[PDB]
Each structure stands twice: as C-alpha cells, then as structure tokens.
mmCIF file of C-alpha atoms and ligand atoms in Angstrom:
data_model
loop_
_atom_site.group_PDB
_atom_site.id
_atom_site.type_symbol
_atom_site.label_atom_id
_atom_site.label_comp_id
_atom_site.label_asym_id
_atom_site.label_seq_id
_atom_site.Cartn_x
_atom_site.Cartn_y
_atom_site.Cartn_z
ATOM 1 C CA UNK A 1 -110.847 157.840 107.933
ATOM 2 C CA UNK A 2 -109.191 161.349 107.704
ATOM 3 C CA UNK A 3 -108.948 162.938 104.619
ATOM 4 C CA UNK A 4 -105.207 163.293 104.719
ATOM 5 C CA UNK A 5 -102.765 161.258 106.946
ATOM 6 C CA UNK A 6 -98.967 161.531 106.307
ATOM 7 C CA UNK A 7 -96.501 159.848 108.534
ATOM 8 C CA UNK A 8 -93.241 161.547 107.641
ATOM 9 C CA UNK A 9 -94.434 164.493 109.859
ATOM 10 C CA UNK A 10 -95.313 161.570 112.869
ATOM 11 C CA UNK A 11 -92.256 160.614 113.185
ATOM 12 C CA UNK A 12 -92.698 156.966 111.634
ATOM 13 C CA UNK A 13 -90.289 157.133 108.752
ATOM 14 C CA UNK A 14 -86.831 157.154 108.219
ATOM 15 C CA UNK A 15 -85.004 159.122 105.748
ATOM 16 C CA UNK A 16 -84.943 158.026 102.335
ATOM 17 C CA UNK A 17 -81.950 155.682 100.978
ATOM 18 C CA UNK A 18 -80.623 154.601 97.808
ATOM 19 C CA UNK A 19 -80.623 150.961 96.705
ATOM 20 C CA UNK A 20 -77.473 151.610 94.500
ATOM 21 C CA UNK A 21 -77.827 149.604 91.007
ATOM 22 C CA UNK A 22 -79.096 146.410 93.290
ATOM 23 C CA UNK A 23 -82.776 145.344 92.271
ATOM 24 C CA UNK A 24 -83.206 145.436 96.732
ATOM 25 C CA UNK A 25 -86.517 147.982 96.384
ATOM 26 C CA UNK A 26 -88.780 145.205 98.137
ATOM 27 C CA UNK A 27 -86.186 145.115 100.912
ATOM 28 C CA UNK A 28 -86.493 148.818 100.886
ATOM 29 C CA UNK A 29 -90.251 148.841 100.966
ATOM 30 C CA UNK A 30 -90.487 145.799 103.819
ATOM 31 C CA UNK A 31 -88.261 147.672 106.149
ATOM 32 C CA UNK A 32 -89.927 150.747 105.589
ATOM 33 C CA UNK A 33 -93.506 149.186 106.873
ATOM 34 C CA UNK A 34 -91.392 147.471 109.402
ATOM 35 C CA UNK A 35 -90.126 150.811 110.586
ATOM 36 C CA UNK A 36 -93.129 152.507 110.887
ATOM 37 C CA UNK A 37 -94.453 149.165 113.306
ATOM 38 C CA UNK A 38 -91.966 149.480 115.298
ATOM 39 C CA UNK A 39 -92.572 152.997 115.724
ATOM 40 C CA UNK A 40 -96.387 152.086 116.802
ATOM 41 C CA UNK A 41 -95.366 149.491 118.681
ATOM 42 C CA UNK A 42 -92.277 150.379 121.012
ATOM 43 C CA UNK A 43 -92.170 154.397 120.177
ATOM 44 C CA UNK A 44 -88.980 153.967 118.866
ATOM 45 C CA UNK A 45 -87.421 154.903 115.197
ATOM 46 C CA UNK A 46 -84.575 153.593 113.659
ATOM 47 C CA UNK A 47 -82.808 152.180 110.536
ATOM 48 C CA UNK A 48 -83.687 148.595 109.747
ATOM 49 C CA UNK A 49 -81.352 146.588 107.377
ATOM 50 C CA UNK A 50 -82.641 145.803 104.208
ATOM 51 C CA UNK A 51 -78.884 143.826 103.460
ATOM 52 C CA UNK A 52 -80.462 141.899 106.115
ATOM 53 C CA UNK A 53 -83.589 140.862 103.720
ATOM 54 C CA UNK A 54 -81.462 140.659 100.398
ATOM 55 C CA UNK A 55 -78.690 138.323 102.046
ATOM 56 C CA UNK A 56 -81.205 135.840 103.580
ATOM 57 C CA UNK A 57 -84.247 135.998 102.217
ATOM 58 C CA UNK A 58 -83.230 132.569 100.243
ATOM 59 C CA UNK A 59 -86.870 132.464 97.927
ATOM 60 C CA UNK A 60 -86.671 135.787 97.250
ATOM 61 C CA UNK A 61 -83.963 136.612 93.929
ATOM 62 C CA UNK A 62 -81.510 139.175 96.297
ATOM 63 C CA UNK A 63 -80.736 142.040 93.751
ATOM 64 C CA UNK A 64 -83.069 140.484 91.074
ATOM 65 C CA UNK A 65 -86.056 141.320 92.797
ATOM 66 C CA UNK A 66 -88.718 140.010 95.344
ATOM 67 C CA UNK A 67 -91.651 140.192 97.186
ATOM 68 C CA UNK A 68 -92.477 142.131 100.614
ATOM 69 C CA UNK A 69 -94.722 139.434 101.607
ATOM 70 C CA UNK A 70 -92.029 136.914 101.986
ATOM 71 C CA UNK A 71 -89.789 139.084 103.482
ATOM 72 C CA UNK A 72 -91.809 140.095 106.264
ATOM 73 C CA UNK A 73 -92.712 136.109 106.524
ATOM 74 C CA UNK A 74 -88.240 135.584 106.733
ATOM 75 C CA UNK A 75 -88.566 138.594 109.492
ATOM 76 C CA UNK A 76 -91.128 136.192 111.577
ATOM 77 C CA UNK A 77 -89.699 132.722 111.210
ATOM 78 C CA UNK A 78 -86.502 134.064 112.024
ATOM 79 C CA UNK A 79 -87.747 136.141 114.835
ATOM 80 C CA UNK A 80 -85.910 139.077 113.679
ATOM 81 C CA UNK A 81 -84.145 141.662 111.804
ATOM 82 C CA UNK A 82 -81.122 143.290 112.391
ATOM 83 C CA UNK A 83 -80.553 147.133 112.482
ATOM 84 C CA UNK A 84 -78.678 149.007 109.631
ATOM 85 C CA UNK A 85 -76.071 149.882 112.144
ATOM 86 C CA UNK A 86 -75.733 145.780 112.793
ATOM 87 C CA UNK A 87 -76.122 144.948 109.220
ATOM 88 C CA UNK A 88 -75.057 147.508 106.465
ATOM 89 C CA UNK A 89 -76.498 148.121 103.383
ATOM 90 C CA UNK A 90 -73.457 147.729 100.377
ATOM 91 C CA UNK A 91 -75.678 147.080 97.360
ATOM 92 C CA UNK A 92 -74.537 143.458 96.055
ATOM 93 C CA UNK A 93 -76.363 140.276 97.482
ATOM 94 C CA UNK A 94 -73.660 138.944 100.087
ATOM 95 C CA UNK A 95 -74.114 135.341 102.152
ATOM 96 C CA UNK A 96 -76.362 135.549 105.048
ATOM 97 C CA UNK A 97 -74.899 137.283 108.131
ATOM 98 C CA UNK A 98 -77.871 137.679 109.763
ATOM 99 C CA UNK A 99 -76.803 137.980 113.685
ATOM 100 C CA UNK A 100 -79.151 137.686 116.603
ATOM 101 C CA UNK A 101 -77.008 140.490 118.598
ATOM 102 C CA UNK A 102 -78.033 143.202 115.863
ATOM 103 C CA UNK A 103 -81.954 142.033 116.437
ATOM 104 C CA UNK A 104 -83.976 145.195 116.227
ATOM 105 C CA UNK A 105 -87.561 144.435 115.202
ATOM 106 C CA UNK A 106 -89.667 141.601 115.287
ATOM 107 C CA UNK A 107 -92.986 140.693 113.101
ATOM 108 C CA UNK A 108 -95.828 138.088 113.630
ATOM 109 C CA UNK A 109 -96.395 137.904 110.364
ATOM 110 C CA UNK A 110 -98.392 139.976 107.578
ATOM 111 C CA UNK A 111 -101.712 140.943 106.195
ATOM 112 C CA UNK A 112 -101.993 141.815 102.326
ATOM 113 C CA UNK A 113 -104.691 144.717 101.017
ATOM 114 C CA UNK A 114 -107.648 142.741 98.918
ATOM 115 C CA UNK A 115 -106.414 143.620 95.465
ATOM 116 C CA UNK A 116 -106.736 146.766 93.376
ATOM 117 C CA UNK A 117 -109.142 147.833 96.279
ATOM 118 C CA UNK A 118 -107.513 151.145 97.156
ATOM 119 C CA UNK A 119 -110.220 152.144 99.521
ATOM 120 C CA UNK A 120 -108.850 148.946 101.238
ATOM 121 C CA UNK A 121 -105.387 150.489 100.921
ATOM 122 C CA UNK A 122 -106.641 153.672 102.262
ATOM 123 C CA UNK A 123 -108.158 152.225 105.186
ATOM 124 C CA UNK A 124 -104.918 150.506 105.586
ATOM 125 C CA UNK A 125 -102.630 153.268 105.626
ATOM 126 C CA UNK A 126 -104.909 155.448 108.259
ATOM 127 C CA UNK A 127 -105.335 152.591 110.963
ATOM 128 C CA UNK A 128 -102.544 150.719 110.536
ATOM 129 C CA UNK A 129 -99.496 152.934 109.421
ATOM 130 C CA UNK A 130 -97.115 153.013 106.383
ATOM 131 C CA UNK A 131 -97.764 150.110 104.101
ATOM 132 C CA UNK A 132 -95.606 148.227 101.126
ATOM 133 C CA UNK A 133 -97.036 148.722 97.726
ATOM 134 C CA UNK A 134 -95.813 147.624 94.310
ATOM 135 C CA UNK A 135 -96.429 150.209 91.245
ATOM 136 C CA UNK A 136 -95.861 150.104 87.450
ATOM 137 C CA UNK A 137 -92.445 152.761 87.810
ATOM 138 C CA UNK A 138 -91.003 151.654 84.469
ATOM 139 C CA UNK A 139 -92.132 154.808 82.200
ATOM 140 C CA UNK A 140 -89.817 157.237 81.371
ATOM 141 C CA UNK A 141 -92.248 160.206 83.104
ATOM 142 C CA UNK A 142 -91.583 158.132 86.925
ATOM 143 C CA UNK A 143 -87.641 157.871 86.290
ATOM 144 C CA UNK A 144 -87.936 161.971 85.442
ATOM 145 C CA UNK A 145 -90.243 162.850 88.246
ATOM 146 C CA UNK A 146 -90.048 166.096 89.850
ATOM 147 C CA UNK A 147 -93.895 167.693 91.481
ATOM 148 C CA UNK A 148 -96.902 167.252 91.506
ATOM 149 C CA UNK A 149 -99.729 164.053 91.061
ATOM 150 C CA UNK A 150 -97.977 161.483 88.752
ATOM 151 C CA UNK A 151 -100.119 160.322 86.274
ATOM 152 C CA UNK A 152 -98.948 158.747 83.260
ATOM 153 C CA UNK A 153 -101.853 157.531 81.011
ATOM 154 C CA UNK A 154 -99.431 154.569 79.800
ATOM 155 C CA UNK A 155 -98.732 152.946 82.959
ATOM 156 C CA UNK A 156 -99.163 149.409 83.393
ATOM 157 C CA UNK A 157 -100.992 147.761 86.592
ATOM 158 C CA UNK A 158 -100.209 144.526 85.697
ATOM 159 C CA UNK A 159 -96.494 145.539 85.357
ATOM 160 C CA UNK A 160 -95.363 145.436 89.312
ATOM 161 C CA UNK A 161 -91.554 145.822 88.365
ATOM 162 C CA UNK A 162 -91.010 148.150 91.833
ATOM 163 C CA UNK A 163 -91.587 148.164 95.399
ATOM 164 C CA UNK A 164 -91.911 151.293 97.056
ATOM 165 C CA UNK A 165 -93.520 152.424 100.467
ATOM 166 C CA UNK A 166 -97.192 154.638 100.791
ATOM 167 C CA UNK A 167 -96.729 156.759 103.710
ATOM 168 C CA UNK A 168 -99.832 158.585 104.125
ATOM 169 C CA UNK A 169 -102.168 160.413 101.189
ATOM 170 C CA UNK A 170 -104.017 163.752 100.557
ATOM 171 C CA UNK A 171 -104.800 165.731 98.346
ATOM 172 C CA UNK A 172 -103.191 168.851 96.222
ATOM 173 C CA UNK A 173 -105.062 171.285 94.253
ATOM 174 C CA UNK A 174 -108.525 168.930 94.527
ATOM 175 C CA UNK A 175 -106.088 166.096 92.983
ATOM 176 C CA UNK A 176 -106.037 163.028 95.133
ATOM 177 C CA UNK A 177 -102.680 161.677 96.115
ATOM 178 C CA UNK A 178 -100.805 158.737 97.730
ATOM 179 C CA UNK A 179 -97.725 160.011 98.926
ATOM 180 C CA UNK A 180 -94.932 157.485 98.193
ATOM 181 C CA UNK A 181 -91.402 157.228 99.585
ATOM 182 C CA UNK A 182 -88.990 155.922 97.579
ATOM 183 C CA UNK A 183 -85.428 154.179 97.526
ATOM 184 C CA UNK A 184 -83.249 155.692 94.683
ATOM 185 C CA UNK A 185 -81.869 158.524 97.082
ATOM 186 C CA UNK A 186 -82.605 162.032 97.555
ATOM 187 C CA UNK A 187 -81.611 163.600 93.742
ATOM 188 C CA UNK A 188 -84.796 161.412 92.702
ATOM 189 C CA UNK A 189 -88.345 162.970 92.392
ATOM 190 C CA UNK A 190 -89.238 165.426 95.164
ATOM 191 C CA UNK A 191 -86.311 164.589 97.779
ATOM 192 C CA UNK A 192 -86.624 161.319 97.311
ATOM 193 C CA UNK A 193 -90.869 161.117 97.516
ATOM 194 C CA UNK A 194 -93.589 160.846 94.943
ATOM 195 C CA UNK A 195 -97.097 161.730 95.126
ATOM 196 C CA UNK A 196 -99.219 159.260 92.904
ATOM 197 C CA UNK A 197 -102.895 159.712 91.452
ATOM 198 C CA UNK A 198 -105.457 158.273 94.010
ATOM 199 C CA UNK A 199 -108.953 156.660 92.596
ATOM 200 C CA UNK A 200 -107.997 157.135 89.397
ATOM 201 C CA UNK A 201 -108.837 153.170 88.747
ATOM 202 C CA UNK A 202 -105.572 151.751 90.376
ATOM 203 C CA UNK A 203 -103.154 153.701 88.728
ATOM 204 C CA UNK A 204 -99.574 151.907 88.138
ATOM 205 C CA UNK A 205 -101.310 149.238 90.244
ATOM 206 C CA UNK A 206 -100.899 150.886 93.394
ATOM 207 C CA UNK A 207 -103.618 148.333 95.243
ATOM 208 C CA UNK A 208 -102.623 145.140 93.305
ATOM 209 C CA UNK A 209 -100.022 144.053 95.841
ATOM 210 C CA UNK A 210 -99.892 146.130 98.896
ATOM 211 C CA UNK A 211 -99.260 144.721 102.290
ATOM 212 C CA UNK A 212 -97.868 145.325 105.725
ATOM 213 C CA UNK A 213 -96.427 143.320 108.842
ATOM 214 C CA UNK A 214 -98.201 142.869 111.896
ATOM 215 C CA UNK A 215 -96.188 143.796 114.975
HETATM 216 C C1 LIG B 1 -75.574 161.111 95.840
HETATM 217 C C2 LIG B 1 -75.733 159.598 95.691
HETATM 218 C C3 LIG B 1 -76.384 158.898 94.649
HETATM 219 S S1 LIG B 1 -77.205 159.676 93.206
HETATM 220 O O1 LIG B 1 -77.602 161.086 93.556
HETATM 221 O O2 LIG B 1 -76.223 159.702 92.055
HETATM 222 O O3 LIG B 1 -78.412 158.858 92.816
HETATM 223 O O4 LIG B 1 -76.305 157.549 94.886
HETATM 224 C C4 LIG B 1 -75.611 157.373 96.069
HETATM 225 C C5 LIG B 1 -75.258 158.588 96.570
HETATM 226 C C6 LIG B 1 -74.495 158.639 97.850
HETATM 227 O O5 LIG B 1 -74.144 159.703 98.359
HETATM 228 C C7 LIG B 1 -74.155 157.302 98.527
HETATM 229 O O6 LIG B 1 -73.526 157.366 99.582
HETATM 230 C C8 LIG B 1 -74.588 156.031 97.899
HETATM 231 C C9 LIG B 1 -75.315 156.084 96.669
HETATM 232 C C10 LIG B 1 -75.722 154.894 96.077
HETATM 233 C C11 LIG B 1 -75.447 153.672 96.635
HETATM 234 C C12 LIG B 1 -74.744 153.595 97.824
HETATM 235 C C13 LIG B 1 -74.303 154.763 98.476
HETATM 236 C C14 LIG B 1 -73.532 154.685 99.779
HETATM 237 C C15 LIG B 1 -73.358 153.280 100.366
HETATM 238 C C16 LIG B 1 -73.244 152.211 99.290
HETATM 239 C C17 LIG B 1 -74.471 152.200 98.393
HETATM 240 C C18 LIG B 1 -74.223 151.220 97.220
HETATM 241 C C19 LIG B 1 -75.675 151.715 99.209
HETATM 242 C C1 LIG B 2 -89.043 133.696 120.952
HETATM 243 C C2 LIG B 2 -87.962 133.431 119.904
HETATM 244 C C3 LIG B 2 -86.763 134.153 119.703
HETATM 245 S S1 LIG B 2 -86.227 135.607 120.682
HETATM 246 O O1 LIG B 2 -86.543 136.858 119.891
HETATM 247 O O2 LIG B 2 -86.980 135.637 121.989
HETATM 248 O O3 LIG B 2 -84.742 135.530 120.921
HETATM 249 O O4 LIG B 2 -86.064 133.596 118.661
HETATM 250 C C4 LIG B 2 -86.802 132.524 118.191
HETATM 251 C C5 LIG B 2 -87.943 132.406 118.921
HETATM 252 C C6 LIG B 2 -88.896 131.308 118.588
HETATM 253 O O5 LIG B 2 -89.946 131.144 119.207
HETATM 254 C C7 LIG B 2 -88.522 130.373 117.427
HETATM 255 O O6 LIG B 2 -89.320 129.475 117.167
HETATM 256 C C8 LIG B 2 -87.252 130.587 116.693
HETATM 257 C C9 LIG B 2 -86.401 131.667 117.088
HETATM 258 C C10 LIG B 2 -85.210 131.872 116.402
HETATM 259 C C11 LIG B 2 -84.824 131.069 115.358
HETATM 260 C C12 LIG B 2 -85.629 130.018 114.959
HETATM 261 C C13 LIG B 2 -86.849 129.757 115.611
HETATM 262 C C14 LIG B 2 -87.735 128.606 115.176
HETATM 263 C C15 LIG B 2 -87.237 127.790 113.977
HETATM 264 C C16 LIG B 2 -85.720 127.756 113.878
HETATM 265 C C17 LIG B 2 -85.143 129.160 113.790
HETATM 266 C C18 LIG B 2 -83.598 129.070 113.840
HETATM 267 C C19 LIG B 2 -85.570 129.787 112.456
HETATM 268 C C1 LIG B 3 -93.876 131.720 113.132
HETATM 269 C C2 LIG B 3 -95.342 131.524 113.521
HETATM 270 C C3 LIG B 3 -96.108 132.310 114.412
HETATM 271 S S1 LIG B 3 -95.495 133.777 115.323
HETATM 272 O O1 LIG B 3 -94.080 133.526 115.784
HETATM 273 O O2 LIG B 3 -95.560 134.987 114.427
HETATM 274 O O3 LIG B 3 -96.383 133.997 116.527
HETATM 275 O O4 LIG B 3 -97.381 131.804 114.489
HETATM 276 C C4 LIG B 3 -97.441 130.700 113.657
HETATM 277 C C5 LIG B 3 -96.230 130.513 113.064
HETATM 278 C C6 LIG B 3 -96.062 129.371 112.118
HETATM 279 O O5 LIG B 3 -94.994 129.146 111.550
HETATM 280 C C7 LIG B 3 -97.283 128.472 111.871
HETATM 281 O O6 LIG B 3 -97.135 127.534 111.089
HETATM 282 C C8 LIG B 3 -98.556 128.764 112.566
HETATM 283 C C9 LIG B 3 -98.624 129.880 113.455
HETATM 284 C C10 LIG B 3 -99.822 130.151 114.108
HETATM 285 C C11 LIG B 3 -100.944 129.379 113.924
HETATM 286 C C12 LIG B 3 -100.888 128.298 113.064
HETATM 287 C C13 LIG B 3 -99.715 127.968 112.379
HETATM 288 C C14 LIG B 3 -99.694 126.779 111.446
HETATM 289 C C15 LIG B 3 -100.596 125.611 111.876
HETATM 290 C C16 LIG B 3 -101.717 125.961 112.854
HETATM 291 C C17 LIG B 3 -102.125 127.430 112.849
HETATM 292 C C18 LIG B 3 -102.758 127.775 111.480
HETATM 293 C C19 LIG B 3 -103.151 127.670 113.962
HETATM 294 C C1 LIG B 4 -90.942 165.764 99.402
HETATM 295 C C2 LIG B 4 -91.621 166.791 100.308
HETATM 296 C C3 LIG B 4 -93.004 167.047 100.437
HETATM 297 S S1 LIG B 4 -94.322 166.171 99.512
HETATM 298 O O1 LIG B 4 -94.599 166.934 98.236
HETATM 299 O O2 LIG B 4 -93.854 164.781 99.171
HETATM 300 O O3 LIG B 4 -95.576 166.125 100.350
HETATM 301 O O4 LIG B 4 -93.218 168.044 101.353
HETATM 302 C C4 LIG B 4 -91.975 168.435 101.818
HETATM 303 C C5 LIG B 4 -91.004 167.701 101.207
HETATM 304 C C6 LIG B 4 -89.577 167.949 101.553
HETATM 305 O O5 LIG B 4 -88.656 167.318 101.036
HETATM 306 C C7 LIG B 4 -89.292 169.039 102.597
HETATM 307 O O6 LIG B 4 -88.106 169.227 102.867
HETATM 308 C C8 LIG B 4 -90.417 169.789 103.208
HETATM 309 C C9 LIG B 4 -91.758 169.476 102.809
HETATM 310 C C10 LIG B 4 -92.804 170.184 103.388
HETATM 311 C C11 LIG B 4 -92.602 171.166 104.323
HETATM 312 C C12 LIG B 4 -91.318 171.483 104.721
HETATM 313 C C13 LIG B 4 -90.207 170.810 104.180
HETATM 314 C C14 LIG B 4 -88.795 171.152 104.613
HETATM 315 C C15 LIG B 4 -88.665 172.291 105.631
HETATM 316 C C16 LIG B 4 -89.868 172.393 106.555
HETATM 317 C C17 LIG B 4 -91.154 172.588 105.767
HETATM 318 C C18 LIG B 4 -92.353 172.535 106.745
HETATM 319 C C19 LIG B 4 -91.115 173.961 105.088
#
C-alpha cells in the first residue's frame, strides 16, 4: 500500500450533506461507498439517494438507525438505487418510492473488513476505494470537532452509534490519520471531514464494522 491515499482529490466523492435531525447516517455512509464504485466502475460521479435507503430498506429502523451492510444487500436484490436527483433527500422516513426510471447504480453485493483489523481496513481503502465504517461519535470532543487527529481517550469501540465514510488516510505531523467524511453538513468539523487516530488500537471502533459494496 501507499502511505497516504485520499479520494476527495480523485474525484470519487461527492460533497458532503446533512442528514437533518433524521438518524439516516448509514444511508449516508452506504451511498458514499456506493459513489465512489461507481466512480471505479463506469468513471462517472454523481449523487446517490440515501431517501432511497431510509424509505425502503424495510429491516433497517429508517431515521432510527441501521446498518450499511443491509443496505448495500436492499441495493442488490433490488438491482438498484435511484439518484438524488430521482429520489430526494427530505429528512423524515417516507413510504417506499423507489422507481426503476431514477436507477443509477447497481451492487452485487458486499464484503465486510475482518473486525477491529485496521490494517485490513487500510488495505481496503487503498485497493478498493472509499469504504463504510461505524465509529464511537457520541463524546462531546467529536460533536465540537474542528483540526487536527481526533483522539478522545474516552471513546467507546463497542459503542457504534454512527456511520460515517473513510475516504483515504495519511498522516499529519508523524500522527496517523483516517480521513473521514461525514453527514452533518459543512458547519461541522473541518468542512464537513474528520481526520481520526490510525493504529492507535481501534480507536472509536473504526475497524469493528467497516464494509463496502462490490460493483
Ligand atoms: C446550513 C445548514 C445546516 S447547519 O449548518 O445548521 O447544520 O443544516 C442544513 C443546512 C442547509 O443549508 C440545508 O439546506 C439543510 C440542512 C439540514 C437538513 C436539510 C437541508 C436541506 C434539505 C432538507 C434537509 C432536511 C435534508
Ligand atoms: C437484471 C435485473 C434488473 S435490470 O437492472 O437489468 O433492470 O432488475 C432486476 C434484475 C434481476 O435479475 C432480478 O432478479 C430482479 C430485478 C429487479 C427486481 C427484482 C428482481 C428479483 C426479485 C424481485 C425483485 C422485484 C426484487
Ligand atoms: C442477488 C444475488 C446475486 S447478484 O444479483 O448480485 O449477482 O447473486 C446471488 C444473489 C442471491 O440472492 C443468492 O441467493 C445467491 C447469489 C449467488 C450465489 C448463490 C446465492 C444463494 C444460493 C447459491 C449461491 C450461494 C451459489
Ligand atoms: C477538510 C479539508 C482537508 S482535510 O484536513 O480533511 O484533509 O483539506 C482541505 C479541506 C477543505 O475543506 C478544503 O477546502 C481544502 C483542503 C485542502 C487543500 C485545499 C482546500 C481548498 C482550496 C484548495 C486547496 C488545495 C488549498
């Protein structure tokens, strides 16, 4: 692997969005790694519609949370997901209105990290492209973000309570980072992005529940 890979500057993510007050982050985080597939595979970028995931992923709990893994599993049974433009995001779980005409990705399934192994997740991230993670972002020093390599010494990486989407990693000033993009909008952390400690044994849980779709 390299020793720094970050996507944003490939042109394989999207700008960042805001989820609203709905608990849609997982829907945030599939569509991300969705994005970035479809970028490897077809060379094209667009908005996917995480509305799409919330509305009719019917195990998954809409606004009350979820996990990527099923998503991307609705995105392959149903052979498809519709575009943002075809299927906008409002922030409430509505009925399904999923509609083949919007279709604008397709997945063949989805292959999760071995977990807490963030060499794994490194690996995973340099081959294969941006990949869904779940983190600990329930302290008080994550909702106040601003710079740097987060590291709060009380986070929890058996507490998964978010879903957010690892788009490359590096390092700043010798500390080793995942860089994360996020979905509570721009005025959040560094426009939107985090950097997160790397091999600092799994911190927040980056590597207990990281996965990605297979295009
Ligand atoms: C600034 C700002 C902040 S924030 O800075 O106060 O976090 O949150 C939002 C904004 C917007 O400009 C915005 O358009 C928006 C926001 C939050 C949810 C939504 C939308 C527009 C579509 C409907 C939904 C519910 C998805
Ligand atoms: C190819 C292809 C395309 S498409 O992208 O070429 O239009 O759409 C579908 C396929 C399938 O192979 C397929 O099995 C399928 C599709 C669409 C909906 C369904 C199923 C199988 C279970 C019932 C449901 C309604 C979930
Ligand atoms: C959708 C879909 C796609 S695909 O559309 O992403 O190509 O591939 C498969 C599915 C299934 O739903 C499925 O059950 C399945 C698939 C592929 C192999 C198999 C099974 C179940 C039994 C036998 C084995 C294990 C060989
Ligand atoms: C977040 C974040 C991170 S990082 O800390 O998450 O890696 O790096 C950047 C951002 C930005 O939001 C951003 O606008 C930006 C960044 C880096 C270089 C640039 C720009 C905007 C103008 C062009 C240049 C090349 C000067």
């Amino acid at each position: 692997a390299p020793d720094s890979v970050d996507y944003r500057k490939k042109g394989y993510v999207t700008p960042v969005k805001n989820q609203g007050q709905c608990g849609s982050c997982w829907a945030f985080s599939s569509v991300g790694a969705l994005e970035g597939q479809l970028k490897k595979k077809t060379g094209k970028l667009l908005n996917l519609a995480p509305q799409n995931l919330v509305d009719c992923v019917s195990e998954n709990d809409g606004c009350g949370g979820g996990y990527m893994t099923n998503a991307f599993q609705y995105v392959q049974k149903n052979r498809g997901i519709d575009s943002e433009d075809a299927y906008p995001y409002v922030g409430q779980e509505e009925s399904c209105m999923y509609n083949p005409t919007g279709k604008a990705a397709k997945c063949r399934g989805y292959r999760e990290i071995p977990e807490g192994n963030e060499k794994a997740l490194k690996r995973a991230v340099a081959r294969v492209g941006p990949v869904s993670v779940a983190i600990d972002a329930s302290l008080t020093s994550f909702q106040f973000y601003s710079k740097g390599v987060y590291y709060d010494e009380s986070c929890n990486s058996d507490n998964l309570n978010h879903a957010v989407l690892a788009v490359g990693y590096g390092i700043q000033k010798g500390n080793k980072h995942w860089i994360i993009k996020n979905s509570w909008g721009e005025n959040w952390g560094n426009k939107g992005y985090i950097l997160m400690a790397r091999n600092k044994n799994n911190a927040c849980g980056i590597a207990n529940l990281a996965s990605f779709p297979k295009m």
